[model samples]
Target: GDDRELAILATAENLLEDRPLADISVDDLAKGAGISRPTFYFYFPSKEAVLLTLLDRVVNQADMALQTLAENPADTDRENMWRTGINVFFETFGSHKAVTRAGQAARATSVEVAELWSTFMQKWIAYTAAVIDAERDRGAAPRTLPAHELATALNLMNERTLFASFAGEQPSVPEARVLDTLVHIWVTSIYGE
Candidate 1:
């Protein structure tokens, strides 16, 4: 089953390389994979499904990376686990550029995909809130603002960074710069500069 999905994704990639996602059609995908258009629909209800499947793969990989960082913070050489987590995310998206772009396009074109994206983002916010709470509990973070609010702010920063980077903008500063910026934001907002 996963192999079939991979095949579909590969075909989509081939088509996307030739044209924009919006211009690519189910017929193009089917023909690219040497299958009938109806057969393509049987496997994936819509092009958006293919994009969602790709996003699911990326999200699963990213979730594992973040989980490792969260679970083994002490063993990780990163100075700040939260910031490291964000960097890992961007680095992964950078590696999987085509699929990431497809997912973004799907979300923009289809309301269903956009809602799915929103749900995943909400989950990320929850996960980030937990990470911040743990940091505060461990005394590694100063108790300044409420943990949940801080988590929401950090999540917003992350989402915006992703969008900017995807737009070919210099969305993220260097690691040191991001570290300083996030730390300053946390400190000033919570503990009063």
Candidate 2:
């Protein structure tokens, strides 16, 4: 089971490098994985499911990186923690650009994909809100808005900005610039410096 399913996922990842998800079919995936159509279906019902599995892996990596900041934000320099999380996020997203772009494209029509995306976002928002609450309690971040509200805004901003920047034919802005801008916003917004 491990060998076959891993082969199928690996084949799908390789195929995504040369073509968009919509353009790749289950037959192509089965052929790439050296498995029959029925075998491919045994591991994954559709190509989208394969992509979703890959996307989940990448997103979880990013989440782990972000969790490093959220776990004990007060103990670390706020700006440094934010910078590390932002850098890890962009790096992970860049490495998985193909699957990410595919997920974003499929999000509109795929209920499962959309729910997965929403679930991860809500987790991020909740984590960020907790960090914000801690900082505000310490008299650091501004108390202008509720922590949850501000966290929601910031998380959505990151999602929209990254999706546009990474999913495009060409980045409208330099990757370094986008990362720097996001880090700046997060640091300044959360730490007020």
Candidate 3:
């Protein structure tokens, strides 16, 4: 039995955090994990396979609050749902910036990658839009911008702000400001108060 697979993934995660996946080599993955190229090939067919695993990990690691908002009763703290949702978005995206960056990078370069992330993005949009529609029905939020449209914009806002905050070039968006701005927009855009 060997954790060489585990070590390789761990090393890949760390290396991707510091550099883009395209810049990294299989050799780096193997040696960094104290394994050889043959063993690395034995485990993962290729580097993209490792990245795809990393992508899956990012999705699975996402906070439960994202899904929890859907399961709660309408009587729940209405505003706090948005708050908690955005809060977790910030936490999850910030913490996993490495995979997030590489995932989008793949999204740009590979049809398969884009399809997976695109589906996930659609789900997130639907999730947030559903919550918005419910908020209107419950009278927690005034009838205003269309729910799906707003949800799409807000979520895209999150991905952009998060990317800039964590991976953009010089004069990057600050994490603190990201939270502040995102929370405010998610709050005001939904409730308009």
Candidate 4:
């Protein structure tokens, strides 16, 4: 049992190293792991399920970074929080560049992937909105727009920028620059400052 799981994970890492997620198949995975097709299916229901598992692992790191901000009550620095969150997200993406790129590409081909991405976006929006709400409640944001709307906008910008970065078409702006700019845009667009 342990060996099977290890094989799958090893195969996954190998696949991620050589190809985009969309190009990987169950047969390829099975071959890499020295397993039969049926056995691959036995371990993972489908290729999409395997991706879902990987995404969950990547997103968990971001969740933990968010938790860190939540736990440090004295660290009420919104800018620092945004920086940390964005850094966590980007670092993971960079580590698994092929997989993340494949995910972006696959979203266009499969409605299931699109739906999963949408769901992830919504969760991110909610989490960011909660953070914004806290800042607004403390008279920090001072934005006229509702925190929820601002959160949604910020989340959308993040998704767009990340996709562009992965595509290698992003502007020359540094990642931190983009992060700061996104925060500024949110504050100014909402707070009239």
The digit string of per-residue lDDT tens for model 4 on 18-95 reads 777667888988898899999988889987777766666666666676677567644645555576776666677766
Compose the digit string of candidate 1's lDDT tens values, residues 1-193.
6566568888886676546677878888888777888888889998867777777778778778877767766545324544576766777766676777677777767787787778767777788777666766876667777777777887777656565555465645554355466555644553342
Clashes of 4: 0
Clashing pairs in 2: none
**Each candidate's TM vs. the true structure?**
0.77, 0.89, 0.87, 0.80
Which regions of candidate 4 deviate over 4 angstroms?
73-76, 170-192
Candidate 1: TM-score? 0.77
Please write out the lDDT profile of model 3 over residues 44-140, one tens digit for every residue: 9988888888787676556355666556544546565566677766777678789888887888777767877777789889988887888799888
Worst 10 residues of 4 by lDDT: 170-179
What overall lDDT, based on C-alpha atoms, would model 3 receive against the true structure? 0.80
Q: Which one wins by lDDT: 1 or 3?
A: 3
- Lowest-lDDT window of 10 residues in candidate 1? 74-83
Quickly count the clashes in candidate 2.
Answer: 0
By lDDT, the better pick of 2 and 3 is: 2
On TM-score, the leading prediction is 2
- Candidate 3 clash pair list: none
